């Protein structure tokens, strides 16, 4: 089964955000230099690239049903571009501080942004990008936001305050706050996508990855072996693996039942910052962004 | 001032 092949890797300035298009063979990268790139990874030619700002662009996602990309940067701004025409759809100050993470609701016209200003904000693109809600409660930088794909009326925020908070749209306090015991904070949070386990996963500067049952709040497992900050850890949408990446320069693939490491990849691009998985498992593609560029891998 | 996680 596991048969990793290097589909396309290119050098660039540090890749902070990365995302797959669901129906075109494209990957978006958002760089520390303010540039973003959309690559066709099958032909190895750029679809479109934009010098968005001079500040780091830490977050970026496709919104394929609108033909957009949405990005967020340290100059405080969210910007949306039509990837077919290059048109800048909107450009607004979202937070008075860095933007760490953006999530897009799977069906509704909502975007979440998580920020160093201690908040998550919800924006509605059918209401002229209005701020519809600010979720307050975290006490340090909000590093990651993610909808629960099985119930996207709720979402998780991971924060340097050592907690994950799970919230309901339209309600002002968390449904619960998860004390992770990851004392250097939480850099990333992700949901297992399938209905048989109510699992979430967190990654930390404390070198650990933890699996949580979000119904009981118990820690199911702690995955150890990275040697520097763990930037992300995710469940794959079709394969029984977890994929993590670290400032130690490695990606790690772990068995999602036994929680034992299956493969460590020394990609050769220095520190790893971000991850994406092809949302339908096409060619088992994954992509990760690093200090010195990105790589698109086929797992099988 | 950015207290941490500037990279």
Short mmCIF file of C-alpha atoms in Angstrom, two decimals:
data_model
loop_
_atom_site.label_atom_id
_atom_site.label_comp_id
_atom_site.label_asym_id
_atom_site.label_seq_id
_atom_site.Cartn_x
_atom_site.Cartn_y
_atom_site.Cartn_z
CA UNK A 1 0.00 0.00 0.00
CA UNK A 2 2.33 2.75 1.24
CA UNK A 3 4.46 3.63 -1.80
CA UNK A 4 5.50 7.27 -1.59
CA UNK A 5 6.43 9.09 -4.81
CA UNK A 6 7.57 12.71 -5.21
CA UNK A 7 5.00 14.21 -7.65
CA UNK A 8 6.34 17.78 -7.70
CA UNK A 9 8.62 19.74 -5.40
CA UNK A 10 9.78 23.30 -6.08
CA UNK A 11 11.94 25.73 -4.13
CA UNK A 12 10.48 29.01 -2.93
CA UNK A 13 10.55 31.33 0.04
CA UNK A 14 9.04 29.93 3.23
CA UNK A 15 5.61 28.32 2.66
CA UNK A 16 3.28 29.11 5.56
CA UNK A 17 -0.04 28.01 4.06
CA UNK A 18 -0.98 25.34 1.55
CA UNK A 19 -4.22 23.95 0.08
CA UNK A 20 -5.44 21.63 -2.72
CA UNK A 21 -8.10 22.58 -5.23
CA UNK A 22 -10.83 19.87 -5.13
CA UNK A 23 -11.33 19.40 -8.91
CA UNK A 24 -8.31 20.93 -10.63
CA UNK A 25 -4.80 19.47 -10.11
CA UNK A 26 -3.69 22.64 -8.33
CA UNK A 27 -1.98 23.53 -5.06
CA UNK A 28 -1.97 27.02 -3.52
CA UNK A 29 1.03 28.12 -1.46
CA UNK A 30 1.17 31.28 0.65
CA UNK A 31 4.65 32.55 1.43
CA UNK A 32 6.43 34.46 4.17
CA UNK A 33 7.53 36.94 1.49
CA UNK A 34 3.99 38.11 0.76
CA UNK A 35 3.73 36.13 -2.48
CA UNK A 36 1.20 33.40 -3.17
CA UNK A 37 1.49 30.76 -5.91
CA UNK A 38 -1.05 28.46 -7.59
CA UNK A 39 0.71 25.52 -9.26
CA UNK A 40 -0.64 22.87 -11.54
CA UNK A 41 1.31 19.99 -9.94
CA UNK A 42 0.69 17.62 -12.87
CA UNK A 43 2.16 19.95 -15.52
CA UNK A 44 4.50 21.83 -13.13
CA UNK A 45 3.40 25.25 -14.46
CA UNK A 46 1.97 28.15 -12.46
CA UNK A 47 -1.73 28.84 -12.95
CA UNK A 48 -1.43 32.27 -11.30
CA UNK A 49 0.85 34.01 -8.80
CA UNK A 50 0.41 37.28 -6.93
CA UNK A 51 2.66 39.57 -4.87
CA UNK A 52 -0.16 40.13 -2.37
CA UNK A 53 1.72 42.18 0.24
CA UNK A 54 5.22 42.59 1.65
CA UNK A 55 4.26 40.84 4.90
CA UNK A 56 3.94 37.09 5.58
CA UNK A 57 0.81 35.45 4.21
CA UNK A 58 0.27 32.76 6.85
CA UNK A 59 -3.08 31.38 5.71
CA UNK A 60 -4.72 30.58 2.41
CA UNK A 61 -7.54 28.44 1.11
CA UNK A 62 -9.39 27.79 -2.08
CA UNK A 63 -13.10 28.56 -2.18
CA UNK A 64 -13.67 26.46 -5.29
CA UNK A 65 -17.43 26.98 -5.48
CA UNK A 66 -16.78 30.71 -5.94
CA UNK A 67 -13.56 30.35 -8.03
CA UNK A 68 -11.67 32.22 -5.30
CA UNK A 69 -8.65 31.99 -3.09
CA UNK A 70 -8.78 33.69 0.30
CA UNK A 71 -5.60 34.68 2.10
CA UNK A 72 -4.64 36.34 5.33
CA UNK A 73 -1.46 38.21 6.21
CA UNK A 74 0.51 39.90 8.98
CA UNK A 75 -0.52 43.34 7.67
CA UNK A 76 -3.88 42.49 9.34
CA UNK A 77 -5.77 41.94 6.09
CA UNK A 78 -7.92 39.30 4.48
CA UNK A 79 -7.88 39.40 0.67
CA UNK A 80 -9.89 37.34 -1.81
CA UNK A 81 -8.89 36.86 -5.44
CA UNK A 82 -10.66 35.29 -8.36
CA UNK A 83 -8.15 32.73 -9.61
CA UNK A 84 -9.55 32.76 -13.17
CA UNK A 85 -9.48 36.54 -13.69
CA UNK A 86 -6.97 37.71 -11.07
CA UNK A 87 -9.55 40.16 -9.75
CA UNK A 88 -9.26 41.22 -6.10
CA UNK A 89 -12.80 40.58 -4.83
CA UNK A 90 -12.32 42.15 -1.38
CA UNK A 91 -9.51 43.50 0.82
CA UNK A 92 -10.31 44.32 4.45
CA UNK A 93 -8.69 44.64 7.84
CA UNK A 94 -9.83 41.49 9.70
CA UNK A 95 -7.88 41.75 12.99
CA UNK A 96 -5.48 44.30 14.53
CA UNK A 97 -2.78 41.61 14.68
CA UNK A 98 -1.43 38.64 12.75
CA UNK A 99 -3.81 36.18 11.09
CA UNK A 100 -2.73 32.59 11.74
CA UNK A 101 -5.40 30.42 10.19
CA UNK A 102 -8.45 30.52 7.91
CA UNK A 103 -11.17 27.89 7.56
CA UNK A 104 -14.00 27.77 4.98
CA UNK A 105 -17.37 26.24 5.85
CA UNK A 106 -18.16 23.22 3.60
CA UNK A 107 -21.57 24.48 2.38
CA UNK A 108 -22.41 27.81 3.96
CA UNK A 109 -20.75 31.10 2.92
CA UNK A 110 -18.76 31.45 6.11
CA UNK A 111 -15.06 31.94 6.73
CA UNK A 112 -13.34 31.75 10.12
CA UNK A 113 -10.12 33.55 10.86
CA UNK A 114 -7.96 32.92 13.93
CA UNK A 115 -5.62 35.66 15.13
CA UNK A 116 -2.96 36.75 17.56
CA UNK A 117 -5.58 39.28 18.77
CA UNK A 118 -6.91 36.35 20.89
CA UNK A 119 -10.10 35.95 18.79
CA UNK A 120 -11.79 33.92 16.09
CA UNK A 121 -13.96 35.94 13.71
CA UNK A 122 -16.70 34.71 11.40
CA UNK A 123 -17.22 36.51 8.05
CA UNK A 124 -20.16 35.99 5.65
CA UNK A 125 -19.42 36.45 1.93
CA UNK A 126 -23.13 36.62 1.06
CA UNK A 127 -23.45 39.66 3.39
CA UNK A 128 -20.62 41.72 1.86
CA UNK A 129 -17.98 40.00 4.04
CA UNK A 130 -19.65 41.33 7.18
CA UNK A 131 -18.25 40.43 10.57
CA UNK A 132 -21.06 38.25 11.90
CA UNK A 133 -19.45 37.05 15.14
CA UNK A 134 -16.34 37.37 17.29
CA UNK A 135 -15.52 34.38 19.51
CA UNK A 136 -13.74 35.59 22.65
CA UNK A 137 -12.23 33.58 25.44
CA UNK A 138 -8.77 32.49 24.37
CA UNK A 139 -5.88 34.06 26.24
CA UNK A 140 -2.97 33.77 23.72
CA UNK A 141 -2.52 33.58 19.93
CA UNK A 142 -5.19 31.54 18.16
CA UNK A 143 -3.05 29.35 15.88
CA UNK A 144 -5.61 27.20 14.06
CA UNK A 145 -9.34 27.03 13.29
CA UNK A 146 -11.17 24.04 11.80
CA UNK A 147 -14.82 23.19 11.26
CA UNK A 148 -16.05 19.82 12.43
CA UNK A 149 -16.75 18.30 8.98
CA UNK A 150 -19.45 16.06 10.48
CA UNK A 151 -21.20 18.99 12.15
CA UNK A 152 -19.94 22.28 10.74
CA UNK A 153 -22.27 24.25 12.97
CA UNK A 154 -19.34 23.70 15.35
CA UNK A 155 -15.62 24.33 15.01
CA UNK A 156 -12.41 24.04 17.03
CA UNK A 157 -9.77 26.65 17.78
CA UNK A 158 -6.26 25.71 18.91
CA UNK A 159 -4.38 28.27 20.94
CA UNK A 160 -1.02 29.03 22.54
CA UNK A 161 -2.96 29.29 25.83
CA UNK A 162 -2.71 25.45 25.91
CA UNK A 163 -6.38 24.87 25.11
CA UNK A 164 -8.65 23.84 22.30
CA UNK A 165 -12.08 25.49 22.41
CA UNK A 166 -15.06 24.04 20.57
CA UNK A 167 -17.79 26.52 19.69
CA UNK A 168 -21.27 26.64 18.14
CA UNK A 169 -21.96 29.24 15.47
CA UNK A 170 -24.29 31.83 16.96
CA UNK A 171 -23.27 31.15 20.60
CA UNK A 172 -20.75 33.26 22.48
CA UNK A 173 -19.05 30.79 24.85
CA UNK A 174 -17.32 27.48 24.06
CA UNK A 175 -19.34 24.31 24.19
CA UNK A 176 -16.22 23.06 26.01
CA UNK A 177 -12.59 23.94 26.58
CA UNK A 178 -10.12 21.10 26.31
CA UNK A 179 -7.11 21.26 28.62
CA UNK A 180 -4.47 19.58 26.52
CA UNK A 181 -1.55 19.37 28.92
CA UNK A 182 0.53 20.61 25.99
CA UNK A 183 2.16 23.28 28.09
CA UNK A 184 3.92 25.08 25.24
CA UNK A 185 0.47 25.60 23.60
CA UNK A 186 -1.46 24.21 20.66
CA UNK A 187 -0.31 25.10 17.10
CA UNK A 188 -2.87 23.01 15.20
CA UNK A 189 -6.17 21.16 15.62
CA UNK A 190 -7.87 18.83 13.12
CA UNK A 191 -10.88 16.52 13.11
CA UNK A 192 -10.99 12.88 12.09
CA UNK A 193 -13.48 13.03 9.20
CA UNK A 194 -15.33 9.73 9.40
CA UNK A 195 -18.35 8.98 11.61
CA UNK A 196 -16.96 6.02 13.58
CA UNK A 197 -14.72 8.04 15.96
CA UNK A 198 -15.37 11.46 17.57
CA UNK A 199 -11.67 12.29 17.39
CA UNK A 200 -9.64 15.47 17.17
CA UNK A 201 -5.86 15.84 17.08
CA UNK A 202 -3.53 18.59 18.40
CA UNK A 203 0.11 19.48 17.74
CA UNK A 204 2.39 21.47 20.06
CA UNK A 205 5.75 23.18 20.56
CA UNK A 206 6.11 20.67 23.45
CA UNK A 207 7.05 18.05 20.78
CA UNK A 208 3.82 16.03 21.21
CA UNK A 209 0.76 15.19 19.15
CA UNK A 210 -2.37 14.19 21.07
CA UNK A 211 -5.59 12.40 20.05
CA UNK A 212 -8.80 13.39 21.85
CA UNK A 213 -12.27 11.93 22.15
CA UNK A 214 -14.31 15.11 21.95
CA UNK A 215 -17.32 13.52 23.61
CA UNK A 216 -15.53 12.45 26.80
CA UNK A 217 -12.59 14.92 26.53
CA UNK A 218 -10.13 12.10 27.21
CA UNK A 219 -6.72 11.82 25.65
CA UNK A 220 -6.75 8.63 23.55
CA UNK A 221 -3.03 8.70 22.65
CA UNK A 222 0.11 10.82 22.66
CA UNK A 223 2.41 10.50 19.66
CA UNK A 224 6.06 11.22 20.47
CA UNK A 225 9.15 11.38 18.29
CA UNK A 226 9.40 14.80 16.65
CA UNK A 227 12.51 16.73 17.86
CA UNK A 228 11.27 20.31 17.50
CA UNK A 229 7.99 22.22 17.34
CA UNK A 230 5.18 20.19 15.73
CA UNK A 231 3.58 22.59 13.26
CA UNK A 232 0.61 20.38 12.33
CA UNK A 233 -0.89 16.91 12.62
CA UNK A 234 -3.84 15.67 10.59
CA UNK A 235 -5.95 12.62 9.85
CA UNK A 236 -5.94 11.54 6.28
CA UNK A 237 -9.43 11.51 4.64
CA UNK A 238 -9.25 7.94 3.22
CA UNK A 239 -6.09 6.24 4.58
CA UNK A 240 -5.69 4.96 8.19
CA UNK A 241 -2.78 7.28 8.94
CA UNK A 242 -1.97 10.52 10.69
CA UNK A 243 0.46 12.92 9.01
CA UNK A 244 2.54 15.40 11.00
CA UNK A 245 5.32 17.89 10.25
CA UNK A 246 7.81 19.72 12.40
CA UNK A 247 10.52 22.35 12.63
CA UNK A 248 12.80 19.32 12.88
CA UNK A 249 12.45 19.17 9.06
CA UNK A 250 10.54 15.89 8.88
CA UNK A 251 7.12 14.69 7.94
CA UNK A 252 5.94 11.68 9.89
CA UNK A 253 3.29 9.15 8.91
CA UNK A 254 1.73 7.29 11.86
CA UNK A 255 -0.62 4.31 11.96
CA UNK A 256 -4.02 5.68 12.98
CA UNK A 257 -5.01 2.54 14.92
CA UNK A 258 -1.79 1.64 16.73
CA UNK A 259 -0.40 5.20 16.87
CA UNK A 260 3.07 3.89 16.00
CA UNK A 261 5.24 5.77 13.52
CA UNK A 262 5.30 4.13 10.06
CA UNK A 263 7.60 6.41 8.10
CA UNK A 264 9.76 9.49 8.69
CA UNK A 265 10.51 11.64 5.64
CA UNK A 266 13.55 13.95 5.60
CA UNK A 267 12.21 16.15 2.86
CA UNK A 268 15.34 18.33 2.62
CA UNK A 269 13.52 21.70 2.71
CA UNK A 270 14.33 22.62 6.37
CA UNK A 271 11.44 23.40 8.74
CA UNK A 272 7.93 22.16 7.89
CA UNK A 273 5.05 24.59 8.51
CA UNK A 274 1.85 23.44 6.77
CA UNK A 275 -0.07 20.54 5.28
CA UNK A 276 -2.92 19.75 2.90
CA UNK A 277 -4.50 16.50 1.81
CA UNK A 278 -6.36 16.10 -1.40
CA UNK A 279 -9.97 16.26 -0.17
CA UNK A 280 -11.09 13.15 -2.13
CA UNK A 281 -7.87 11.14 -1.75
CA UNK A 282 -7.04 11.55 -5.45
CA UNK A 283 -3.81 9.60 -6.06
CA UNK A 284 -3.48 9.85 -2.26
CA UNK A 285 -1.94 13.28 -2.79
CA UNK A 286 -0.64 15.29 0.15
CA UNK A 287 1.37 18.50 0.11
CA UNK A 288 3.48 20.25 2.69
CA UNK A 289 5.13 23.69 2.83
CA UNK A 290 8.57 24.36 4.34
CA UNK A 291 11.27 27.01 4.84
CA UNK A 292 12.69 26.36 1.37
CA UNK A 293 9.67 25.40 -0.76
CA UNK A 294 6.95 22.77 -1.00
CA UNK A 295 6.47 19.15 -1.98
CA UNK A 296 3.48 17.30 -3.43
CA UNK A 297 3.59 13.57 -2.67
CA UNK A 298 1.50 10.64 -3.87
CA UNK A 299 1.19 8.10 -1.06
CA UNK A 300 -0.31 5.47 -3.45
CA UNK B 1 6.09 43.86 19.51
CA UNK B 2 5.78 40.21 18.41
CA UNK B 3 6.44 38.16 21.54
CA UNK B 4 6.96 34.79 19.80
CA UNK B 5 6.11 32.70 16.74
CA UNK B 6 7.36 35.37 14.34
CA UNK B 7 8.75 32.76 11.94
#
